[model samples]
Target: MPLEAGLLEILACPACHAPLEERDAELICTGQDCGLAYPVRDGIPVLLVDEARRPE
Candidate 1:
């Protein structure tokens, strides 16, 4: 199953409370000041602290 439509509006960076949007198979923060991309697996969001990655 893919991510739900309204998921973007509700999801935020667990660390920054920043807006999150889907990018490919992950939830990415568009804030250039804070580039954090959270991964999603098996259609479930991985919002854990260790799961986030800073985009390169």
Candidate 2:
């Protein structure tokens, strides 16, 4: 299932503190300042910076 709308507004990037945007099955930070994609599993966001996959 996708994330709830209320959660989306409050979720932030642990690295940059920027709001996260939902894309496909992940919440991605398009902020070039952050440059990381955080994953959501089982409808729960894994917001840890270490868990994020840095984009190439």
Candidate 3:
């Protein structure tokens, strides 16, 4: 299932508390030094730091 636009609008990075942008199936942090990518599983955002992926 696709993420809801209303939920996406209110979601933010758990790390830096910065806004997130939808990219495919992930929500990427907009912080310059906090390039964390939180995965979306079944349309649910996995905002855990342990589950986040660093920018390549």
Candidate 4:
């Protein structure tokens, strides 16, 4: 299942604390300087900097 709209609205990046948007089944930071991608497993967001994928 996808993340709830209300919950998605409140979700933010763990690194820069910026808003996150869904992309390729992951949550990516909207901050240009903090382009981190967070994984979503079983509809739960893994908002951890250590586990986040850095932008290329």
- lDDT of each candidate versus the true structure: 0.72, 0.75, 0.78, 0.76
Model 2 bad stretches (over 4 Å): 1-11
Q: How do the residues 1-56 of candidate 1 rate in per-residue lDDT, one tens digit apiece?
A: 98656665475567776667787888787654556877878889877767778786
lDDT, candidate 2, 1-56, per-residue tens = 97656664475677697756788888788655866887778889877877878765
Off-target runs (Cα >4 Å) in candidate 3 are: 1-10
Residue pairs in clash, model 4? none
Return the TM-score for candidate 3, rounded to 2 decimals: 0.66
Local error of candidate 1 at residue 21 (angstroms): 2.0
Q: Is candidate 1 or candidate 4 better by lDDT?
A: 4
| Winning model by lDDT | 3
- Model 3 residue 43 CA deviation (Å) reads 2.0
Instruction: Please name the candidate that would achieve the greatest TM-score relative to the true structure.
Output: 3
Q: After superposition, how far is residue 53 of candidate 3 from its true place, in Å?
A: 0.9
Candidate 2 residue 5 C-alpha distance from true site, Å? 18
C-alpha lDDT of residue 18 in model 2: 71
Worst 10 residues of 1 by lDDT: 3-12
